[PDB]
């Protein structure tokens, strides 16, 4: 009867519709790879998509997907057993290398703009009107570290303008220098912000930015993932 | 075989149990100690799923079903043809549900992420025990919990929602509903948000968040952002799970009366419970 | 370890009145308040909302739909303000009786009032979808929200007007009232025979619950990845960064499938839609073409 065409029916286009779904999917990471980076051989069920071309606004060229994909950047790893499967230990530093939580991607190494073209990310004493409107004001805070040692002052806050929320910490070091620090990774509180991720040696470790006033995409990823790595790599450091 | 961009985070670490024993891969899957444990008490539960099969007389998967105890064996044990086999299957459901959320949390430490994925998913443990396990100890039998059929866990439902009246009126239900419909629309909401960003009309740039934003305000005056929609939604479905277990343990141990008459305290209000007209009286 | 579910500090500049492209500046209202309690959790800005004709037509008719609704509970409340607090939820507006059929003949005090206020929403809500057409169309944007809301408007057109016409009469449709509602539901489950055998009923939970399960990962992922920049959805789709590329990788360790960032909101958008896109049929074929979902079960088809 009609019910059971429509439910045939649906069936039907719910399996075409996971194909689709599925594919879409395989528009980043593909073609798989074996461990040494050539082709795998199985590449699994559904094939490749038709390539599918982005336009990036304000003139930056385009994107097409799926697309070549070099990781555009050197892997200090190396294998640790003879079989695919297992890990690959790092061959020097991991926090400075950046692999494992510590990775970073080849992004482009400009900064991300908002609607109008303008630098999406300012440093607040830069970005007119822009103030703390509720909350501790972290700035001219002391910054510590997972070893309970000071580390540096909070001198700024970096701020997403069109999207009105705090991104970074603008962190001075004791030889006057400064760094960012995500914000998704401090505990701003009453005398102090916190960092559970980093001990205060690792601190100067952080990748500088080369605009005192802009952060790129590259150097965001740098930035964030060498704090994130801490988590694991500076835990030779931590007490509660 | 891995991802292009995959192998610089195939690094050793992050376990919680068994240093580097089970860290390693199988295909794409991360196994560690807790992959080793989500897939003995799942190949365990799965025979003795099978071997409830067996007794029952069926291997239609439309038919098989694993029923709890009677409820005159109250919360003690029963023979394993007799609701036995629905006692171990559900201690290995819940160890392959334990495992499973603990073997994401080593996913999450190698990659360095917050732990936000197994705590969400914790809340759906939550409900399974509180169906499987709190209600029915409180309750004092194996019996008030539901029955591994696909069918037949559907007729446990209806049964137990139908003694209580129209399940409807439970004020718990009523609130769960409500966050399952709100997470919806706001899935839908966020899904068609970025893909009508990121895939505009033919021929023109993508837009930016600076779009998103303008789009909600023109449209209710009010925008929650990129990061409070992904905030919302986890939080949305967490206390629609969370009001389903609640509204699911307060029915046959606190309440046990039909539902519709509990509403009842509010129409009996002594300032008006006696004015004549409207419905009630 | 701080969790991201609330900020730590809010920031405050001048209010955004957002991007400008096709729209008519003219027809934005000044921004409102700024919500500090709302910038703890999202956005402190309120306003500015965008109002042209079918802004006001949609507002006007939706607020008629819900005072003649509102008109009738004060009447069968008989004025008292006690009695309307009293049996709020309990008061009812009706559609017309078997009698009358489809025709709008009826009675005021015995339905016409439920065709008015059915009318009134009618308007009302076709009006807000070619608002949120028109809305994206001017901001140059795809029109996924319209087609998406389709869907919803898709499970009401079916409950309340598609399928009273093809039963041959309104009274088939759901009433106006909040415990009333309720009954009708599961009245309709009664008469056709369990809609739980109904197989777009379950399916259509299956979606429901399954948008619980995917808006509960897709939430607590970015949440676990922006500490790399995650929220930030669309850059990322642009030009993956470590967010994305942690994110994919957690999915295919836990359980061996991928998930691009534009990719899983593919899966966002149809998990959702499909949830009264299938329940709408469900609705639309039961008493319509099958009388007793147990039966039809029974026969399998
Ligand atoms: C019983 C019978 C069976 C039961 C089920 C029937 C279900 C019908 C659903 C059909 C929807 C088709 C939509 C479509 O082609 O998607 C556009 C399309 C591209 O969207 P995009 O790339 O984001 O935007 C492109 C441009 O920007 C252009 O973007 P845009 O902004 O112009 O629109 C983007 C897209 C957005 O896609 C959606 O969100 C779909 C939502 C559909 C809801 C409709 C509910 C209707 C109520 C009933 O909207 C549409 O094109 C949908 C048109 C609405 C038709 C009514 O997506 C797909 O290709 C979906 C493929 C589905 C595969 C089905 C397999 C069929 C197997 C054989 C049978
Ligand atoms: C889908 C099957 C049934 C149905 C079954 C239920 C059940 C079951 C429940 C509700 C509940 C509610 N329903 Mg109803 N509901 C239906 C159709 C509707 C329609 C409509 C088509 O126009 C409307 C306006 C409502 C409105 C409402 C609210 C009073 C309430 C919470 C909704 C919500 O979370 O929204 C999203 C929020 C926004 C602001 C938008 N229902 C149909 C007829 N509805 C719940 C409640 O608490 O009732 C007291 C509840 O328990
Ligand atoms: C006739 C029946 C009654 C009624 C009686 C009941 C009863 C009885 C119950 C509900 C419950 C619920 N009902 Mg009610 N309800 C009715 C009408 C409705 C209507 C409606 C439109 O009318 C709606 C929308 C709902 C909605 C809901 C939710 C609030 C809730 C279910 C979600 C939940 O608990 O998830 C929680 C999720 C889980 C328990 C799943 C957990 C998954 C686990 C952790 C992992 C499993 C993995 C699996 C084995 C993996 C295997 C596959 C692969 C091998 C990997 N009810 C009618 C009136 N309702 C239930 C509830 O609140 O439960 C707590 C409940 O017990
Ligand atoms: C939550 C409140 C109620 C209840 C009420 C309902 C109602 C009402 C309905 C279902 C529906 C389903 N329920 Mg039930 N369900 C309950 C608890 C469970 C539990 C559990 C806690 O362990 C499981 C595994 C299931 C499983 C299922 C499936 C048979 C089906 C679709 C689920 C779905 O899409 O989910 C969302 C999840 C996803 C989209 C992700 C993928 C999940 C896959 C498909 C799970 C398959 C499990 C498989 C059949 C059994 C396990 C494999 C084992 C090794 C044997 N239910 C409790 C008691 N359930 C619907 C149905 O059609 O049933 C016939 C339906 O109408
Ligand atoms: C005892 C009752 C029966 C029952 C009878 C029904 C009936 C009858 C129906 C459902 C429907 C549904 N049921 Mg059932 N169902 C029961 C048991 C269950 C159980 C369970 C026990 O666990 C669950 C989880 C469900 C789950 C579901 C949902 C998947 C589905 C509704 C989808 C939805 O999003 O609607 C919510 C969304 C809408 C109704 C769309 C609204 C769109 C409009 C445009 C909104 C306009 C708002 C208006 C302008 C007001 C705005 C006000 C302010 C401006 C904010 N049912 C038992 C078996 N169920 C529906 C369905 O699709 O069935 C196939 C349905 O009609
Ligand atoms: C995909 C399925 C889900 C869905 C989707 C959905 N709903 C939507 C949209 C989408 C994609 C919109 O774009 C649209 C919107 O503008 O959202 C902000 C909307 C919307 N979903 C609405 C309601 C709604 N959706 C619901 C359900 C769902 N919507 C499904 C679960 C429900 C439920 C669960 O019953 C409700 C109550 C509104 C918030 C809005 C449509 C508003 C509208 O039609 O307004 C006209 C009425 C007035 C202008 C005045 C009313 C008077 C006041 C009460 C006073
Ligand atoms: C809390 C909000 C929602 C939620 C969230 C959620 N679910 C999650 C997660 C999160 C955040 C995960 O990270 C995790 C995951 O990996 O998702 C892909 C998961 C997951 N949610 C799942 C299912 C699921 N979630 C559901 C619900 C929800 N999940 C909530 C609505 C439901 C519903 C609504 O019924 C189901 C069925 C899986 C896809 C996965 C957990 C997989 C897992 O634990 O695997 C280990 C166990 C096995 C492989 C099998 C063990 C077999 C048993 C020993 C024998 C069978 C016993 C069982 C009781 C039989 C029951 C069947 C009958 C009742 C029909
Ligand atoms: C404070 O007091 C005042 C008076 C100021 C205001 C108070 C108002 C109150 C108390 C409002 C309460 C409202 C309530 C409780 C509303 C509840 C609504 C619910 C639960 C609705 C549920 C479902 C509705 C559906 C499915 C409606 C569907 C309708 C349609 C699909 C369109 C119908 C169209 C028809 C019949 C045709 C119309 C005619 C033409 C020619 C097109
Ligand atoms: C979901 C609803 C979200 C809240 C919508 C209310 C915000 C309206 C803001 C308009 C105010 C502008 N005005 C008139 C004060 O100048
Ligand atoms: C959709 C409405 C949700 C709004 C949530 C409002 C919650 C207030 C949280 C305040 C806590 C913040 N702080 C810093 C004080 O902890
Ligand atoms: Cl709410
Ligand atoms: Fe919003």
Known sequence: ?240 | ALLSFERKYRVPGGTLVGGNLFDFWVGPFYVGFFGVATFFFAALGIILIAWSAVLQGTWNPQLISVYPPALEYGLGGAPLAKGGLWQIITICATGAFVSWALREVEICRKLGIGYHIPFAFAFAILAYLTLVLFRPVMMGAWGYAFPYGIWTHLDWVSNTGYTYGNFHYNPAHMIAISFFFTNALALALHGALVLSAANPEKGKEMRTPDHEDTFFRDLVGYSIGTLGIHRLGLLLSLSAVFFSALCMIITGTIWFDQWVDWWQWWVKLPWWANIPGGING | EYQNIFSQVQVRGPADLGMTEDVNLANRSGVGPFSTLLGWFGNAQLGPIYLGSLGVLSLFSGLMWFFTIGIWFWYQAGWNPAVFLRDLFFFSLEPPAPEYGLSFAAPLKEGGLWLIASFFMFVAVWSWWGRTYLRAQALGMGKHTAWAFLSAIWLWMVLGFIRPILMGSWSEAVPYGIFSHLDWTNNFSLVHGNLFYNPFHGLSIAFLXGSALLFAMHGATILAVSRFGGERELEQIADRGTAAERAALFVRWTMGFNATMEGIHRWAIWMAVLVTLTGGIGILLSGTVVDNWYVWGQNHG
């Open chain 1, 1 to 240: 009867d009609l019910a059971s065409l429509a439910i045939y029916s649906f069936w039907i286009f719910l399996a075409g519709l996971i194909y689709y779904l599925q594919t879409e999917n395989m528009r980043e990471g593909y073609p798989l790879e074996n461990e040494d980076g050539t082709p795998a051989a199985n590449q699994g069920p559904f094939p490749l998509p038709k390539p599918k071309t982005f336009i990036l606004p304000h003139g930056r060229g385009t994107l097409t997907v799926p697309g070549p994909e070099s990781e555009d950047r050197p892997i200090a790893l190396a294998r640790t057993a003879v079989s695919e499967g297992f890990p690959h230990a790092p061959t020097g530093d991991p926090m400075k290398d950046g692999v494992g939580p510590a990775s970073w991607v080849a992004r482009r190494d400009l900064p991300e703009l908002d609607g109008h073209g303008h630098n999406k990310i300012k440093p607040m004493k830069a970005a007119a009107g822009f103030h703390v409107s509720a909350g501790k004001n972290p700035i001219g805070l002391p910054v510590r570290g997972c070893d309970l040692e000071i580390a540096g002052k909070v001198v700024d806050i970096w701020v997403d303008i069109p999207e009105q929320m705090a991104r970074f910490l603008e962190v001075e070091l004791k030889d006057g220098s400064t760094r960012l620090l995500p914000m998704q990774m401090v505990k701003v509180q009453s005398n102090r912000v916190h960092v559970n991720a980093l001990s205060s040696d690792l601190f100067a470790g952080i990748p500088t930015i080369k605009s005192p006033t802009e952060v790129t995409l590259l150097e965001e990823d740098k930035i964030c993932g060498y704090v994130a790595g801490g988590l694991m790599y500076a835990a030779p450091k931590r007490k509660s």
